[PDB]
Amino acid sequence: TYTTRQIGAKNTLEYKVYIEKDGKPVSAFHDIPLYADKENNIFNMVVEIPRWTNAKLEITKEETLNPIIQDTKKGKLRFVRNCFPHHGYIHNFGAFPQTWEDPNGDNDPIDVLEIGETIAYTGQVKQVKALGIMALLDEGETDWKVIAIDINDPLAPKLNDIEDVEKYFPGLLRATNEWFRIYKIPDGKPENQFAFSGEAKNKKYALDIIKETHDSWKQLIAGKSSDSKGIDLTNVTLPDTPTYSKAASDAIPPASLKADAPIDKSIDKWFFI
Template sequence: MRAPTSLQHHALRRLSLLPGRTNHAVSACVARRTLLTGAAATGSAAATRLTTRMGLGGGAAPPPPSAGGGATTKFSAASSHFSPSSSSPLSSSQSPLQRTAQIANHLQSPAQRRSSSSTHRALSTMASSSAYSVRKIAAANTLEHRVYIEKDGVPVSPFHDIPLYANQEQTILNMIVEIPRWTNGKLEISKEELLNPIKQDVKKGKLRFVRNCFPHKGYLWNYGAFPQTWEDPNSIHPETKAKGDNDPLDVCEIGELVGYPGQVKQVKVLGVMALLDEEETDWKVIVIDVNDPLAPKLNDVEDVERHLPGLLRATNEWFRIYKIPDGKPENQFAFSGECKNKAYALDVIRECGEAWERLITGKTPAGDVSTANVTVSHSPARIAPDQLPPLPAHQEIPPEKIDSSIDKWFFISGASA
C-alpha cells in the first residue's frame, strides 16, 4: 500500500482543527479515503478487501472504476471526482465513499482540482491509445510487407483516422512510428494504398535502405509521422520559399525506448527543422514520448541541447548527408539549419493540420493520395467498416535477411563540419 500523499496529510491536518464529534467522524472518513487511495493504487482486489474490512457501505464494496470510466461508476481515485458537483452539500443519501471523496475535493484548491481533472483526462486519453494494434502482412524486408493499424479490431488509416491531438488541451500529440531507431529500412505510410498501410519504399523495383554515414547507424531516432497532417505541394511556404512534399509531417522521437512500425506514441513537441529536399519543404518535428524519463525536463528546443548535448547537431548532419552515398547532393536547410522552437513548431503543425482538413474534405484535389477513411464524418471518402475489403490475416513471420552491404559505413568528407 502506498503512503498517504502530501495532499492527504494536509487534509488530515486541517480536519484535526474541527471540533468535537465532527472532528472524529470526518477525520475517520478521510483516513478511510487515504487508505482506499493507497489500496486502489495497488489493485482493485486490495481496495475491495480494505473496504469490506472497514465496513464501508455496510456490505459489498462498490465496484472498482472501469478502465474506460464506465457510466455506472463515476468515482475515480485518480481524479477524486464523482457524479455530484464539488459545490453540492453533503447528503446522507450518498455512500460513505462518495462523502469521503467530496470532503477531499472541498479541501483541494481550485488549481489542485483543475490539475487533478487534467490528469484524469490525460490518463483516459493515454488508455485509449492502447486500443491500437498492428496487423502485419508478409515478412519485413520484402516487397509484399505491409503493416496495417487497427483500433478495437477495425482497420483504420494512420494518415486519416488517428487523431492528431491526444488531449483536449492539444499539448500532447499522437505520432505513428514508421522506422525504429538504429534500423535502415525506409518504411513509410503509403499515401496511395487503401487505408494507407506502412510499407517499405521502393525505387526502381528494389527496396530502399538508408546508408550508414559514419559515425551514425541507421536512423538516429524513432522516425514517423503525425496523423491528420499534410504538407501541401500546392502551397509555397512564405519563409522556406518551397512547396510542401505531399506527405504527412515527419517526426523524430528522441526518447530512450526503441519503437516498432505502426506504434502509436503520445508525444510532446519540442522544436522543428526545415529540410529543403529536392526543392521541397520537408519539416522535421522534434518530439519526445511523454512517458520517457526525460520528458518532464524537456519543454522546448533549448532543453534538448541542455540535456541531450550534440543531438540536434547530429540530427542536422544526418539529414544533410544521408543521401550522399547514393550519389545525391547534400541536402540544405532553411533558417541556416536552426532548429526552431516549440511555438514555431506548433504553428507548422497547425498549418499542416488545416491543409489535411482541406484534403480530406475534398476542397483540395487529392491527386494520387488515397483519402479513404472510416472515422472522419464530414469526409466524402469515408467508408463504413463493413464495406472494407477483407485483409489477409495477421502474420508473425521472421524478417527476410538483408544484404550485408547495408551494414557498410560510409565516411563523408566534411560531414562533421
C-alpha cells in the first residue's frame, strides 16, 4: 500500500512529501515500479501537482529518496500564475517513476498530464493508461508530455487513444497547447513552442517514448549512465543496485504536525496575455 509522509508546512521551503510503502519511505523516482500491469500497459503515475493549484511541486532528483518539494529560484518559492481563462495548472501534473530523459533529453522523469475528473493529491501513486503524447521543444530539449487517464475514472473504458480525448474532452488539447505556450509569460519569459505543430501523437507513439525513457532509467540506476551528476540514486527496493540502502528509509524524519502556510495573495491574480 502506498501512502505519503509530509515534512514541514505546505507552501514553505521546508515542505517535502515522501512516498511510503507499508509505512516506510521509499524513493519516488526509483522505487515505484513504472508498470502496475506491464502486459496491459498500465502505469504507475507519481502525482506532483493537483489540478487548479499554483505551487510548482516536483520530485527532486538531488535529495535522498527524491521527495516532492516546491521549486525555488534564488531562494524564493515558485508558483505558476493564473493565465486567463486557466486557473493554475489545468491537469493533475506528475511523472512516471523509473523513467529518465537522458540528456546525453530534458534530464527528468517523463512528464504526465492526467485528465480525469478527480483532483489528485501530491505524492499520490495512481494507475493510469497512456492516451497520447505531445512534445514541448524547450531550449534544444525535448520535453515530452504524456496524456493519460486514471484507470478508475468513470470514462476510462471509453478512452483508449488520443482521438478519444477530442471526443470526450473537446478543447482540452487546445487548452493544453495554449497553457504550455503562455504559462511562463507572466514570469517574464518567452512563449514556448511545440514540436509537430502542437499535435499530440497517438498511444502507440507514446508507448515507444515511455519505453525508451524506462530503458534510460535502467542504465542510470545500474550506475552505467555517462553522467548522473546531481542525481541521488539511493533506493530501498532494488537490492543489486550500487546505491541500494535500506537505512535511507529510516533516516527520514516523521510526519510533521503542521497546517498549510498561507500563500501570498498576489498568486490570486489573473493575467490576460
